[PDB]
Design a protein around this ligand. Sequence first.
Ligand SMILES: [Zn+2]
Lengths: 126, 400
Amino acid sequence: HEWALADAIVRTVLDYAQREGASRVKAVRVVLGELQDVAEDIVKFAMEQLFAGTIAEGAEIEFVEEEAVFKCRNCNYEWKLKEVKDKIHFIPEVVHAFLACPKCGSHDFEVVKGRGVYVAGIKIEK
Amino acid sequence: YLPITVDHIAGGVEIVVGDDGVKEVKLNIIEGPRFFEAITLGKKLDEALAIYPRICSFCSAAHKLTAVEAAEKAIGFTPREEIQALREVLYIGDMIESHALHLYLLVLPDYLGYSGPLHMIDEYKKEMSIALDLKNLGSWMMDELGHQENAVLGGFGKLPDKSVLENMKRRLKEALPKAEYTFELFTKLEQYETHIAVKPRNGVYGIYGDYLKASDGNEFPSEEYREHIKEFVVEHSFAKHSHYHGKPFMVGAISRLVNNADTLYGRAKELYESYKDLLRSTNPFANNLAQALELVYFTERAIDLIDEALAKWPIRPRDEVALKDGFGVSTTEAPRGVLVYALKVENGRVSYADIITPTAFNLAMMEQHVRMMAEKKLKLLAEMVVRAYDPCISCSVHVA
Ligand SMILES: [Zn+2]
């Protein structure tokens, strides 16, 4: 969810600022996996709202979307999501069952990149 | 800027239990529509009116139906009685669908202990038949009158044929005994399992029905009043509770029955006069039963509205002229409870937007409804307490 994710981000950033003794936060850059169905505008907004009343208020939020990388072990083959994108309703779904390894015929492919979300850049003012 | 790496490890309720008893109960089940309230502004009135039904679209049609009202309430222009009654008809269909779905798919597995595929042949055959009939009826009403983008300000985009309306009336006439049977079935099943205590009820008050109204409903009613909303859970806050008159209160079918009892008529009035004791103003579960009663009332009233709609055979959607600096606060009565739409318009564009959901009203008392004393199993009881309020979606998590 957008608000819960943004809340996690806010709490985490405020905690880190409480660790480094930051007086104020000026800018925040967050890298998000494309597997997340959250809308960037909603998340950004929620972050902007929960930052109010804190030292991280008025910070510039920048989102960086990373791609998703799948790797099937049945033939040790790696492929991307954009390749399977072009091949309409309910297009996004859990890749666990929705799609296979396009080469072998077995769907047990391990998610390597694009599943998680992490903060990339923080502008600390102390 | 400076680049670093912090991997972030990423809807239900949480109850922390203990050997000496339960200590802390908390929930973060819904988000704030604030985002929409900030993106709908600056856009066209119709644009914002197209963005609004995105919030809790599980019951979409209701929102766009009160939004427009607020818009009219902003421009001062009043819709005709015919189109108003039509809005009330669509509203009724939505009500029927939502309540049928909720009551039968959620409350019946709670009491009958069903899980997995709800379709069974040993039982729930006639009940699934009825539920499907009601669902299909309501959804068909919404598909005919309303897919989407049908309801426009001042007047509608497209109106169905009169024959479809007559046939709809016939369908209702055929659907009534199933709603009566539903009311019976929900008159049979259990209340308070016990969670029963003083809960303020809150529901709008209309002249003939609790469908649409301009005055809030409480032991001390009010036409336009803003109640104290409290930001809670701040450590783990996802939403802000609401305190009417400085106290947790409840909305829903129960509230509409308590406040608008005398406004009721027909078979529903008789069933109410009969089961007057079974639905108490202090029990969350009776709401379910009440909804079943509302599956009867709104089935009959609709017909009258149709006979109010056939008062004028030629029907044409009127048009309105926008008004600058216009404040319009429509307070409707969604199936979830009273829904609030506050819209102030300036220069034909959105200036102020404040939308409040019934779920937010029920959240405080639902948090207060937890006097559950059991030793697990209790997750199911809590889930029944929650589904007694008809949430959009819910789940129980117990920390031991
Ligand atoms: Zn493979």
